[PDB]
Design a binder for this molecule. Structure first.
Ligand SMILES: [Ca+2]
Ligand SMILES: [Mn+2]
Ligand SMILES: [Mn+2]
Length: 430
DNA sequence: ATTATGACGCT
DNA sequence: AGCGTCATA
């Protein structure tokens, strides 16, 4: 009872941009705004591969991973924007730079953890405490939460969407104890007020809309964020977790979308996150290991302790290209040319990074895939990265992989290469 | 013939 | 270190 940790010590948010690469292209080209549209890379093979889709286009059934030619079958008026191509490959610089815009705004409010190109976690615990003492114990108006959903509400004893949102919010605010500076529900609510402000700032200063989740930890904040996309934010309280989890497929929780999650389902014979509560911590540890078992035992009760890491910049800078089917590299001159292409983009990004961020990478990782291998990567070798020079890096990369050539002829490369990857790692302050 | 990334876990 | 898992546009 009195000693049962409830994992309600923190306020954590996850902010995720809506249809992010699409919004980047729509800002640039006003003709794409408020239209079914998607972002595509390459074009020759089946119209190119879709990597982002506007909500108008999702209404037609267009999804990520779809070939654009196939997407056009569902949505003949689908508009497309192409990823830039430089040095023979897709170049994602525009989206990386747009990401920096958003991350710098978020950093004004709190320490952030960059979790992807389009999302970051925020630990708002301290900011909430500050805002609470500022408020001087006066109630929180619904007007301060104009885009917030309270998950699980309304409930108990209007047929429009916005009507339902306000009803739930009213019920929530009506129940709040604003006299208690330590009530977790109140702390989450103030957290949500700050996130409204953060999200307003992002939209004002970039033109980009986003969604957000506010809860007591990262996993719940991430889950919350997706519940009412686009352009809305969702508060998932500790108390909302039993009902929420009672019909929540296990694969929906971050880190359980793959083999581990499938094993939880198969081994335990369950489907929903809430069903995990019936197992002892030792039982879960027996099946899924010490770390996973403890994590599952607490997570199915809404509790997780993974900190928001103070890290706004990516830890690695990498350049990758596939060479599918018949385009696989079968000559040494081919392999060397593409290593140079990759190394030149890497040099460009590394030099910008050194100037912007006062650091230098010290290790070069080289990875390849060979025709036939189901694995995404076939071989990964590291060497020293001592100078930001594309010609040196590409020569070094070749040196570390050249023994993979099974061909007796050194001019030929066998078996052909279907992927090259160069990654700079192990940064030090400079 | 989704592709281009990027973090973190295991041994 | 090299490999695997899981994740996101
Ligand atoms: Ca997003
Ligand atoms: Mn995202
Ligand atoms: Mn997505």
């Amino acid at each position: 009872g009195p000693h049962m940790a409830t994992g309600q010590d923190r306020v954590v948010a996850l902010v995720d941009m809506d249809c992010f690469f699409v919004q980047v292209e729509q800002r640039q080209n006003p003709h794409l705004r408020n239209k079914p549209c998607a972002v595509v890379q390459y074009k020759s093979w089946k119209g190119g591969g879709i990597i982002a889709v506007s909500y108008e286009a999702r209404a037609f059934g267009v999804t990520r991973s779809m070939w654009a030619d196939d997407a056009k079958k569902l949505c003949p008026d689908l508009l497309l924007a192409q990823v830039r191509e430089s040095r023979g490959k897709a170049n994602l610089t525009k989206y990386r730079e747009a990401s920096v815009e958003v991350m710098e705004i978020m950093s004004r409010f709190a320490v952030i953890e960059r979790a992807s190109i389009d999302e970051a976690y925020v630990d708002l615990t301290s900011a909430v405490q500050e805002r609470l003492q500022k408020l001087q114990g006066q109630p929180i108006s619904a007007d301060l939460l104009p885009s917030t959903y309270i998950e699980g509400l309304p409930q108990g004893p209007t047929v429009q969407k916005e009507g339902m949102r306000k009803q739930g919010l009213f019920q929530w605010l009506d129940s709040l104890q604003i006299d208690n500076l330590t009530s977790p529900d109140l702390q989450l609510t103030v957290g949500a007020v700050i996130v409204e402000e953060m999200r307003a700032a992002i939209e004002r200063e970039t033109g980009f809309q986003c969604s957000a989740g506010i809860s007591h930890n990262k996993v719940l904040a991430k889950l919350a964020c997706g519940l009412n996309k686009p352009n809305r934010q969702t508060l998932v309280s500790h108390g909302s977790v039993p009902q929420l989890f009672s019909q929540m497929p296990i694969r929906k929780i971050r880190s359980l979308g793959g083999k581990l999650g499938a094993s939880v389902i198969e081994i335990l014979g369950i489907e929903y996150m809430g069903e995990l509560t019936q197992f002892t911590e030792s039982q879960l540890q027996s099946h899924f290991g010490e770390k996973n078992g403890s994590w599952l035992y607490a997570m199915c009760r809404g509790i997780e302790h993974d900190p928001v890491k103070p890290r706004q910049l990516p830890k690695t800078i990498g350049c990758s290209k596939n060479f599918p089917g018949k385009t696989a590299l079968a000559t040494r001159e081919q392999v060397q040319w593409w290593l140079l292409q990759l190394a030149q983009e890497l040099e460009e990004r590394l030099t910008k990074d050194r100037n912007d961020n006062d650091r230098v990478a010290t290790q070069l990782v080289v990875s390849i895939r060979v025709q036939g291998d189901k694995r995404l990567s076939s071989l990964r070798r590291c060497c020293a990265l001592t100078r930001y020079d594309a010609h040196k890096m590409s020569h070094d990369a070749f040196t570390v992989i050249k023994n993979c050539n099974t061909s007796g002829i050194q001019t030929e490369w066998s078996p052909p290469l279907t992927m090259l990857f160069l990654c700079a790692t192990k940064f030090s302050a400079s």
